[PDB]
Write a protein that binds this ligand. Structure first.
Ligand SMILES: *[C@@H]1O[C@H](CO)[C@@H](O[C@@H]2O[C@H](CO)[C@@H](O[C@@H]3O[C@H](CO)[C@@H](O)[C@H](O[C@H]4O[C@H](CO)[C@@H](O)[C@H](O)[C@@H]4O[C@H]4O[C@H](CO)[C@@H](O)[C@H](O)[C@@H]4O[C@H]4O[C@H](CO)[C@@H](O)[C@H](O[C@H]5O[C@H](CO)[C@@H](O)[C@H](O)[C@H]5O)[C@@H]4O)[C@@H]3O)[C@H](O)[C@H]2NC(C)=O)[C@H](O)[C@H]1NC(C)=O
Ligand SMILES: CCCCCCCC/C=C\CCCCCCCC(=O)O[C@@H](COC(=O)CCCCCCCCCCCCCCC)COP(=O)([O-])OCC[N+](C)(C)C
Ligand SMILES: [Ca+2]
Lengths: 496, 273, 301
């Protein structure tokens, strides 16, 4: 028997009130204190000119400041100067003037936008592909030399369309091009970054031919705000000792019984372990070390928690089948836990193929090729099919448990008092956890949709609330409190 | 002697697929077909390349034995029939040196001589005579009005070593002059310090490709009876022996078809009431 | 540096002393706006070239017609666009940004604010004309704001939309010029209204019949009837169409009958050069051949 069957309504209401207070505090921490999850800064690349200086030794072109490159205001000036292609190097300096990058920006995600002008005799080919000769460097202080971080060729397919009528009256207007995913780094260990892009032309090898009339290259740099990272780490620092204390208490509650634990208790402990793995802020070491694999590690942690939560729901429903069921052997749940395992493996493989390869090559992206897109879509579709199978199984099991309960209720008065109380407690357990889980899931989905549609912040009175960050903090606290309440209320009770 | 540099009549029924190469520079280039049209003078002697798709560019060429016109008269001749009466569309032929790649021809290929009628709107109904000279694609100064009706019309260009030229349409003279007078090849004489005579304008080092590179909103035109030769005489007799002999039969055939259409129209108007 | 710059209001010249770097960007923006205005109306009898003398904002139009509304709106939008664009590429440092907590405010907000405080200071004298120019400037800035291209990218757990970031990027100024041309094609006639207690009008309302409300903030307004623009007259700010090109055909406002207002054409064998037949790289390689032709272009008598 759990704790929750024994608890009177007053103690249950007290626990619910405390959890609601902590939920409200979790929402407010993100709403009022946090500055917003991510910041996007748009960079216009400076069209530097290589006056045949980079012959053998690699040279770095700096957009501005001291040692600023010889640059072109608009690319038409290269014709009177007779400056050929293969010399115009688009250069971006990632921190805008008089700013610095810091490790508290937990990642650097870059995209590319091309400004391709429509010209009647210089249109984009049907299957055009641009192959940027990208070079990226880092620096820690403004007086040191640039150090090469990466140097790759980056082919990207152009998805540009032109909406205006194709007449000389509308020549010079830009194509409507989709953004090109450029690169992502899981660490910002350095202060200043320099990015150099070239578009070499070769008719014989068909390199950068027919990509239209490119005027400007615009880079957008997304990073996590330092204030949001600090608030997140404070939240995790609060949550880690709490979950550790409740984990130790639950383990001691489980092991010092006169009987071995049942499967449900082991699954609850496994869910607690999966959440403790998230709560531990190993990302606070990323501010001291250049660990580019932190994004993939965090993704794997989140996926492990999702898989364990989905498994726990089905195990709970199975263990609350009143009649001729509730066997404490995990092997009997391979039918319903199987979809979770297959979907998790497929998503893990997809993440390794996308973010795992990017550790060796920041500019890699699985979608650059048709075959890669097909493979990624195959993994995602298998994961979605497994999710649909899991939800079908979960709905069937919930319906079956409710059918078994409704068939049990009629026979209760004929049973002994002890069995009556046992079955009533099981019914209360199942109903309470199902209602709580439905409330939490509905609120999570509703706030996810709200944050997706809302512009991001709301202005009310003398304060502004960061909705898109209150979402993260509130849901994180919500599921931490869900795990705490599950681990406390469903721990075994001791008779006296 | 009749030095025939190029000549075609399509009497073999499938020679156009063997001697003419379709360009592949762009995916959506239109396709020519070998057809006599809805009306003609001879069923097989007047079967030529017909444009088939509306609002399409066209690119197709045939290679021939390389030759140079240095010190020799050059004659180009061909016939066009506009079955659709284009409101905009070209009907000209381009000559290229053998260095041109026939599979990559497009609207920007460097030709030696461009000649033939061009129509786009009521404003322009002229015959193009363009010479690529020292990097300048000089267009003819005098305006030559081209024919417009559905009937087959013959076009001929003659260039001579003495810098003189003439344009023959329907085996009849329509234009004449000199290369250095009717084009902006040389700087103007006024004595201008920049001036310098150059009698070698007419001479090209090599001709090796004839091509059809034209845009048409209304497809349906037919090209036939090409000729590239050194002899003005053989040009005139050839034009008489293809266009002239078929002219009477073709004209009677159009007249009969128009009479039938008029009869159908008037009887339909009578029966509708 | 603004001692040399003509036409600036005395308060604006103080803003030069405040930000000597930003005045160059504002001048570039005003010139971009005037270039776009000259392109949009190149075929009209008013080619946006009453500017017989050079000022930073262009010579003021004596008649507050639809043309003046378009000019003011395009100038204000160009100033804001240039400020933001120059900020994005590091040509201005103090713009935007604090950085390590919230990552600065949006660039367009700084651009619009500075453009407003600069441009709207030009309307020194209070008058119905000043109200019209302020309305048109705000309409231009609002049209610039409405046309910002929003984009978003999802970068959540496995790349899903669990987390996403959105940003607004400037529209290229030719698109905004066409948008403001469309606004010009449908501008509304307005009239000032004066309160007896105030002794001076403060707001304006629609003059067009079957309406009495205030015009919306994103709609070009005008207070005077447009001149003929084809006879030169400095009393009405008309430059005239004497010597202007014409196509000599039926299409409206470009045919030589309408452009010259019945004075006829004039031809002179212009003989174009017409570079053509090129093989292009994406920016900078050309090997064309000039297909020169003795064409005729017709000018107004
Ligand atoms: C005054 O007002 C009148 C009244 O409205 C207006 O007159 C209008 O004029 C326009 C322009 O022609 C007409 O629009 C046309 O409408 C057609 C149907 O909608 C379109 O098909 C046509 O498209 C052609 O023109 C546009 C712009 O010029 C091009 O972008 C388009 O690609 C088409 O170009 C080809 O059209 C013809 C096809 O035969 C060619 O004659 C023309 O030169 C061009 O050819 C190119 O492509 C071919 C294909 O390979 C090449 O071979 C050509 O190069 C070769 O020839 C050139 C010289 O011609 C040499 O230099 C070169 O060396 C050679 O290789 C070319 O590269 C138009 O959109 C409209 O109908 C008219 N309206 C009327 C009459 O009412 C107009 O506003 C004013 N008129 C004037 C005269 O100013
Ligand atoms: C259906 C659509 C529902 C989509 C909901 C997904 C939204 C994610 C919630 C915020 C993310 C989060 O807080 O992750 C935290 C735990 O993650 C959890 O504990 C939340 C688990 C949600 C349970 C899903 C049940 C929904 C019912 C069905 C940990 O995050 P992190 O690994 O430490 O780093 C990420 C930080 N970042 C989020 C700022 C990048
Ligand atoms: Ca034939």
């Amino acid at each position: 028997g759990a704790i929750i069957e024994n608890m009177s309504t007053k103690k249950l209401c007290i626990v619910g009130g405390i959890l609601l207070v902590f939920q409200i505090i979790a929402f407010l921490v993100g709403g009022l204190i946090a500055p917003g999850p991510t910041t996007a800064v748009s960079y216009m690349s400076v069209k530097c000119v290589d006056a045949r200086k980079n012959h053998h030794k690699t040279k770095w072109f700096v957009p501005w400041g001291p040692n600023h490159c010889d640059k072109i205001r608009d690319i038409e000036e290269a014709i009177p100067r007779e400056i050929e292609a293969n010399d115009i190097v688009f250069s971006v300096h990632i921190p805008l003037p008089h700013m610095e990058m810091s490790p508290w920006f937990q990642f650097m995600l870059f995209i590319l936008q091309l400004d391709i002008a429509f010209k009647l005799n210089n249109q984009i080919r049907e299957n055009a592909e641009v192959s940027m000769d990208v070079s990226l460097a880092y620096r820690d202080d403004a007086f040191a030399e640039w150090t090469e971080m990466a140097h790759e060729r980056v082919p990207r397919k152009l998805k540009c369309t032109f909406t205006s009528p194709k007449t000389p009256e509308h020549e010079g207007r830009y194509y409507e091009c989709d953004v090109l995913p450029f690169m992502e780094i899981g660490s910002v260990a350095h202060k200043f970054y320099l990015l150099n892009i070239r578009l070499p032309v070769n008719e014989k090898k068909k390199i950068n031919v027919g990509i239209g009339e490119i005027k400007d290259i615009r880079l957008v740099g997304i990073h996590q705000n330092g204030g949001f990272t600090k608030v997140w780490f404070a939240m995790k620092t609060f949550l880690t000792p709490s979950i550790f204390i409740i984990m130790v208490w639950y383990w001691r509650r489980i092991t010092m019984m006169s009987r071995p634990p049942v499967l449900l208790e082991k699954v609850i402990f496994a869910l607690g372990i999966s959440m403790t793995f998230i709560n531990i802020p190993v990302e606070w070491f990323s501010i001291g070390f250049d660990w580019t694999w932190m994004l993939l590690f965090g993704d794997i942690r989140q996926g492990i928690f999702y898989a364990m939560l989905l498994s726990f729901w089905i195990i709970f429903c199975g263990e609350h089948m009143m009649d001729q069921h509730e066997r404490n052997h995990i092997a009997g749940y391979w039918k319903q836990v199987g979809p979770i395992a297959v979907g998790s493996f497929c998503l893990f493989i997809f993440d390794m193929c996308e973010r795992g390869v990017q550790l060796t090559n920041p500019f890699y992206s699985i979608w650059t090729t048709d075959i890669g897109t097909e493979l990624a879509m195959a993994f995602i579709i298998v994961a979605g099919i497994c999710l649909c199978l899991y939800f079908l199984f979960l709905c069937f099991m919930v319906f079956q448990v409710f059918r078994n309960i409704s068939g049990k209720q009629s026979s209760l008065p004929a049973m002994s008092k002890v069995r009556r109380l046992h079955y009533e407690g099981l019914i209360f357990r199942f109903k309470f956890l199902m209602l709580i889980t439905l409330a939490c899931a509905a609120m999570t989905v509703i706030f996810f949709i709200v944050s997706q549609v809302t512009e991001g912040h709301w202005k009310w009175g003398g304060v502004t609330v960061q909705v898109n960050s209150a979402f993260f903090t509130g849901i994180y606290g919500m599921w931490n409190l869900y795990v705490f309440a599950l681990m406390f209320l469903y721990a075994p009770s001791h008779k006296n | 002697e009749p030095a025939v540099y190029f000549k075609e009549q399509f009497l073999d029924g499938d020679g156009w697929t063997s001697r003419w190469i379709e360009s592949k520079h762009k995916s959506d280039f239109g396709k020519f077909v070998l057809s006599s049209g809805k009306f003609y003078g001879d069923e097989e002697k007047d079967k030529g390349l017909q444009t088939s798709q509306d609002a399409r560019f066209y690119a197709l060429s045939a290679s021939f034995e390389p030759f140079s016109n240095k010190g020799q008269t050059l004659v180009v001749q061909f016939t066009v029939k506009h079955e659709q009466n284009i409101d905009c569309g070209g009907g000209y032929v381009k000559l290229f040196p053998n260095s041109l790649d026939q599979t990559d021809m497009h609207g920007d290929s460097e030709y030696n001589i461009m000649f033939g009628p061009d129509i786009c709107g009521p404003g322009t109904k002229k015959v193009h005579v363009i010479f690529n000279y020292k990097g300048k694609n000089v267009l003819i100064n005098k305006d030559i009005r081209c024919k417009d009706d559905e009937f087959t019309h013959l076009y001929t260009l003659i260039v001579r070593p003495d810098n003189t030229y003439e344009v023959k349409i329907d085996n009849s003279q329509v234009e004449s002059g000199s290369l250095e007078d009717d084009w902006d090849f040389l700087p103007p004489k006024k004595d201008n310090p920049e001036y310098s005579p150059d009698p070698s304008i007419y001479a090209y080092d090599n001709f090796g490709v004839l091509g059809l590179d034209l845009w048409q909103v209304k497809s349906g035109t037919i090209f036939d009876n090409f000729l590239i030769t050194n002899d003005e005489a053989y040009a005139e007799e050839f034009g008489n022996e293809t266009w002239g002999v078929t002219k009477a039969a073709e004209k009677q055939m159009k007249d009969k078809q128009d009479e039938e259409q008029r009869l159908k129209e008037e009887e339909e108007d009578k029966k509708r009431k | 540096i603004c001692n040399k710059i003509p036409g600036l209001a005395p308060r604006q010249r103080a803003i030069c002393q405040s930000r000597p770097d930003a005045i160059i960007v504002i001048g570039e923006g005003s010139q971009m706006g005037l270039d776009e205005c000259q392109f949009q109306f190149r075929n009209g009898r008013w080619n946006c070239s009453a500017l017989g003398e050079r000022t930073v904002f262009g010579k003021e139009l004596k008649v507050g017609s639809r043309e003046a509304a378009f000019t003011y709106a395009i100038i204000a939008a160009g100033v804001a666009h240039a400020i933001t664009a120059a900020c994005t590429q590091g040509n201005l440092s103090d713009c935007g940004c604090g950085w390590k907590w919230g990552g600065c405010s949006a660039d367009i907000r700084y651009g619009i604010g500075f453009a407003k405080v600069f441009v709207d200071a030009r309307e020194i004298k209070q008058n119905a004309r000043t109200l019209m120019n302020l309305h048109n400037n705000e309409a231009g800035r609002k049209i610039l704001e409405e046309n910002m291209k929003l984009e978003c990218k999802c970068h959540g757990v496995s790349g899903s939309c669990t987390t996403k970031t959105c940003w607004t990027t400037l529209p290229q100024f030719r698109e905004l010029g066409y948008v403001l041309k469309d606004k010009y094609n449908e501008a509304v006639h307005v009239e000032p209204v004066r309160a007896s207690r105030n002794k001076r009008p403060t707001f304006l309302k629609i003059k067009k019949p079957l309406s009495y409300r205030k015009p919306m903030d994103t709609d070009l307004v005008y207070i005077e009837k447009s001149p003929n623009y084809c006879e030169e007259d400095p009393v009405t700010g008309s430059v005239g169409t004497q010597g202007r090109a014409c196509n000599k055909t039926a299409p409206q406002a470009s045919g030589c009958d309408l452009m010259c207002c019945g004075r006829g054409y004039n031809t002179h064998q212009y003989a174009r050069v017409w570079q053509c037949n090129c093989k292009f790289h994406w920016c900078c390689y050309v090997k064309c051949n000039t297909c020169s032709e003795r064409t005729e272009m017709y000018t107004c008598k």
